[PDB]
């Protein structure tokens with residue numbers, strides 16, 4: 001799983017992988033890396049339960065769009 | 072199960088169990104949150 005803002009994100013369908021520097025979520029039978037967003041993943045619980053969770057940011061698709069108008 | 076379809080591909084056993092849970096229709100967060108309890112139950116069953 002992934003720790004983003006005190007929450008644990010799990011992949012909807014796929015698995016979290018990293019090439020060495022960045023993290024992606026890909027379908028389990030074909031390497032198709034994709035940016036981890038709130039759509040690929042779903043939240044559940046908090047950060048202090050899962051064994052092996054890792055810090056990483058999660059990109060929210062709606063956030064940049066709204067900030068554009070506000071800017 | 073990958074070694075049954077082709078070349079064996081490694082995967083952490085916790086994640087494999089998460090896949091199995093997804094298979095039986097239970098979200099993997101259940102396993103990732105009850106991992107210790109599930110491991111204890113499995114070991115106890117093997118001992119029994």
Ligand SMILES: *[C@@H]1O[C@H](CO)[C@@H](O[C@@H]2O[C@H](CO)[C@@H](O[C@H]3O[C@H](CO[C@H]4O[C@H](CO)[C@@H](O)[C@H](O)[C@@H]4O)[C@@H](O)[C@H](O[C@H]4O[C@H](CO)[C@@H](O)[C@H](O)[C@@H]4O)[C@@H]3O)[C@H](O)[C@H]2NC(C)=O)[C@H](O)[C@H]1NC(C)=O
Nearest residue numbers: 017018019020021022023024025032033034035036057059
């Ligand atoms: C794991 O995957 C990561 C995927 O992001 C890898 O990080 C990425 O590495 C690539 C390759 O270095 C970077 O791509 C190019 O980045 C700069 C400029 O960045 C712009 O283009 C990127 C295209 O990938 C976008 O992703 C960026 O957002 C940004 O818009 C380029 O200048 C580099 O060179 C290219 O351009 C010059 C000038 O035209 C050419 O001369 C070159 O030949 C080439 O065409 C990179 O190609 C990318 O920025 C980077 N992304 C991130 C988020 O870090 C990561 O390296 C990889 N890790 C391992 C261990 O494999």
Ligand SMILES: *[C@@H]1O[C@H](CO)[C@@H](O[C@@H]2O[C@H](CO)[C@@H](O[C@@H]3O[C@H](CO[C@H]4O[C@H](CO)[C@@H](O)[C@H](O)[C@@H]4O)[C@@H](O)[C@H](O)[C@@H]3O)[C@H](O)[C@H]2NC(C)=O)[C@H](O)[C@H]1NC(C)=O
Nearest residue numbers: 101102104105106107108109110111112113114115116117
């Ligand atoms: C779901 O099923 C699980 C297995 O039945 C439940 O897990 C059990 O929950 C109890 C309470 O947390 C655990 O007991 C805790 O830890 C130890 C265990 O030793 C005692 O065991 C029994 C009670 O289980 C008790 O009667 C004995 O006298 C022992 O003293 C003790 O310190 C406490 O009892 C403490 O409560 C069990 O150990 C635990 N079993 C396993 C295999 O982990 C679980 O609670 C059920 N409910 C949920 C929401 O998961």
Ligand SMILES: *[C@@H]1O[C@H](CO)[C@@H](O[C@@H]2O[C@H](CO)[C@@H](O[C@@H]3O[C@H](CO)[C@@H](O)[C@H](O)[C@@H]3O)[C@H](O)[C@H]2NC(C)=O)[C@H](O)[C@H]1NC(C)=O
Nearest residue numbers: 002003004005006007047048050051052053054055056057
């Ligand atoms: C995921 O991200 C957070 C940071 O945003 C990491 O939590 C941080 O972990 C360090 C310890 O490694 C904490 O530093 C120290 O913690 C002790 C704990 O009592 C505290 O007393 C000290 O004052 C000091 O802060 C840090 O507090 C903590 N930060 C937060 C906000 O909790 C976490 O480790 C990252 N996960 C992984 C696997 O790296």
Ligand SMILES: *[C@@H]1O[C@H](CO)[C@@H](O[C@@H]2O[C@H](CO)[C@@H](O)[C@H](O)[C@H]2NC(C)=O)[C@H](O)[C@H]1NC(C)=O
Nearest residue numbers: 001002050051052053054055082083084085086
């Ligand atoms: C990786 O496996 C281990 C247990 O070996 C956990 O961290 C390791 O702990 C030992 C003892 O400190 C070290 O020798 C290793 O360097 C540690 N990292 C390893 C083995 O990769 C750790 O919890 C496990 N990582 C995950 C994501 O589950």
